[PDB]
Amino acid sequence: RFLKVKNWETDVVLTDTLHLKSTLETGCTEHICMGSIMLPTKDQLFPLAKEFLDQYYSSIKRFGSKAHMDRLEEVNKEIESTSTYQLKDTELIYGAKHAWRNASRCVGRIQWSKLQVFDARDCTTAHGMFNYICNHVKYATNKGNLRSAITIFPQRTDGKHDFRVWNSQLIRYAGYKQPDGSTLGDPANVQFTEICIQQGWKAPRGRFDVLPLLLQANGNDPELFQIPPELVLEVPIRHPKFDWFKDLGLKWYGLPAVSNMLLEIGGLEFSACPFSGWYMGTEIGVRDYCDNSRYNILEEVAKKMDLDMRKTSSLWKDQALVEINIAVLYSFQSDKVTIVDHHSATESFIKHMENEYRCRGGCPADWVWIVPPMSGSITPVFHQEMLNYRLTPSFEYQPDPWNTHVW
Amino acid sequence: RFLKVKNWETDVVLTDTLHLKSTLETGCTEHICMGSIMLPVRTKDQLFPLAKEFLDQYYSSIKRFGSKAHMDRLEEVNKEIESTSTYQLKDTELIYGAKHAWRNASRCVGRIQWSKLQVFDARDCTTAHGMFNYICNHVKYATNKGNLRSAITIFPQRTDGKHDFRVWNSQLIRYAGYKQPDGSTLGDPANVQFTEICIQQGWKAPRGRFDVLPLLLQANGNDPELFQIPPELVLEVPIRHPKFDWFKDLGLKWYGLPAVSNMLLEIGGLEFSACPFSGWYMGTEIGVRDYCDNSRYNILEEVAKKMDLDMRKTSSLWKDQALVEINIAVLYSFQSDKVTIVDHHSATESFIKHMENEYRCRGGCPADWVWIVPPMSGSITPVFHQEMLNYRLTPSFEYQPDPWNTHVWKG
């Protein structure tokens, strides 16, 4: 019931007590671990509101004070007559910071308390949504010196007046299925891209076409918008030693801004809540570029390095993978766009774990996601046992809007 | 209850029904996943169901479920248990058991080979010398001059827990570790503690970087005894690189035969506390973990110095760069010397095929993603993208405590 985690590289041992405050369910049982699966009323709202407000007032060292009790009554009265309630700005901000603090799949959490929260609960239309998004993109981009931010649209009511950003990220490249059979651009966005065309997007049909925004306010049908291009910072990808690298014609965007998740604070559901940080280099260089089902560039790159691709055992895939990731990091650095390499980010996360163990009694973390997708065992997180559990406030996955929205 | 697993690269969905036959616990609860935690004398009472289950399984595999021969063997095991408090496995059952423990080993990427396993029955063994002789034969048979063959040697089962056979070594062949007064380590830091015990038991340590450890063998609950494996039976491979002529001057070698000797084999409720088994290496075991772990040989710094990488900023990926060249060297060396080895691309591709076959023919393949995904280049191997279900089937290989922690010394 009190639990220990061991780092097998350093013998450091931490005791987890935070997991007992755990709430939601994991997918695992005592018979079966589901650790590697990607996706495993008024009467209901009040405990959830209480639980959240209890932790809020404890964090500002005002637990069981008049001001605590008063808020608890006030929120109860609001639920009884309105069926929902509204968060104070202070609670909104605390909730968002903590949803990030609790994201067990996020390696970047050492940063959790430096989060700029933009309160868009007064938003009513898609145009409004678009204005809030550009301002987010611009604020967060900051001419390359990226700053974490989240923009929070109004909460769910009856589930028929939902706010949603249909894109999976604010900024992503298009994907087109071709007559030849293969895919041009980003195969991960093929279906979303079709929807844009269907809604009227004039697609350029290139390899790196920044997608338009598809925004849904108050459960209305969604509308298309083009982010001003002067707002979309991109990095052409070159290599510090290989002059020929430029001719592969690779670029990526500087701002990763996940836009399809649901933020749950104190039982309330914010279905549109795009947030952004900055990239760890492997996200682009390993995953986006080398996933077989993404840009899948290993074959082309290895060809240019004149490696022996006859047998898997020459580790040609591995050699190329390294240089691709050297080139991503080098390019971002040379253009002064914030980026972090996987050594430095995992090292920071180990320091963060220690801090959370020491100040909070633990830190939920999903080893499967924390360990980078290259050079795993040479990063310290590989050797670190982690306990995964589900704390609230949280970010959660939610069904894609098109499978659900009624036109 | 059917369970689905998806490969996010191919969109192949599989359906697990096998997990329904699982008994043992995971360490996970509905509230906590312990999927990354490394380590999460029986009664007559508890033993017959365990026997029955196993024999029900054995007899189904041979298409003789419910046969007279099946019933008679149940009644015979039943009687033997009441009369003697334990029972003996027939040869066939032991072979089937050992193969299934491998088949059930959720952390093993090499399981496509599970049906080709040479089983050496060492249940007639009574002394440490007897153990040494069995072990020597296992090593020579498995090595087979570089054309490695899987094998396991099975020493007598636990009786009252006071008469255990144990191999105190963690692998049959492994290099000494030596902690120096100045705090550095010579040789493999992973074996310092076992090395000290050896020294204390009377081993004369050569005190070099790659000294093959002596075998430390416990028979019948007696104190263990030391034995040098004949060096002519220890196949080793000097490590060189196909293009970097300086690589050899690092002085690295490794042994060809990986043979885990510290695990416990459970079959039909019976506990075989000494059951060394061997396969062959996947390249990364040596070139990533054994050479490049900070708590192992830790050669990344020295290799990157010789390649002249930018070592001032971690974002040069100097570590990743050296890591690949080291692994190229390991594979090159083994292949050039004709010692079986498998790269992590080919081994993981094989596992995916095995796993798919196992779903079609068995209703599942329990698998531990944390261990199956290789320690370098994870996502460019198909297993990274494969959803897995981990659960515990018997027969099985279990962890057991280190014997120097439990052993009652006789003197």
Ligand code: HEM
């Ligand atoms: C500041 C720098 C940040 C870094 C370096 C970082 C890093 C990462 C990485 C590498 C992942 C795995 C994502 C993937 O492989 O697709 C991840 C996931 C995640 N991050 Fe962070 N992140 C940062 C900021 C943030 C912020 C500001 C938030 C929320 C306010 C956040 C919340 C999350 C969540 C919820 C996930 C899991 C999302 C999913 O399941 O796809 N991150 N992060």
Ligand code: HEM
């Ligand atoms: C034939 C070639 C084989 C290959 C390439 C192979 C590969 C591997 C690898 C890479 C691991 C993880 C090892 C580590 O990281 O320390 C492993 C674990 C394991 N293997 Fe296999 N293996 C093979 C044969 C066998 C055999 C013959 C057995 C038993 C009959 C076996 C049983 C196991 C078990 C029980 C584990 C988990 C051990 C632990 O938790 O420390 N393997 N295998």
Ligand SMILES: C[C@H](O)[C@H](O)[C@H]1CNc2nc(N)[nH]c(=O)c2N1
């Ligand atoms: C099947 C497996 O869970 C899946 O591939 C996961 C593994 N780890 C991951 N880790 C990160 N950071 N991102 C991912 O998309 C994934 N995919």
Ligand SMILES: C[C@H](O)[C@H](O)[C@H]1CNc2nc(N)[nH]c(=O)c2N1
């Ligand atoms: C903490 C973590 O579980 C531990 O480092 C594991 C991770 N994955 C592993 N995978 C393999 N194959 N072998 C190992 O020793 C480990 N170590």
Ligand SMILES: CSCCCC(=N)NCCC[C@H](N)C(=O)O
């Ligand atoms: C906004 S999410 C965390 C913030 C910054 C980040 N680095 N992670 C985003 C996931 C991006 C995805 N892996 C990609 O490679 O585009």
Ligand SMILES: CSCCCC(=N)NCCC[C@H](N)C(=O)O
């Ligand atoms: C005998 S166990 C499986 C058979 C062979 C194997 N490949 N795995 C053994 C573990 C070896 C360990 N990783 C090492 O680096 O020595």
Ligand SMILES: [Zn+2]
């Ligand atoms: Zn689990």
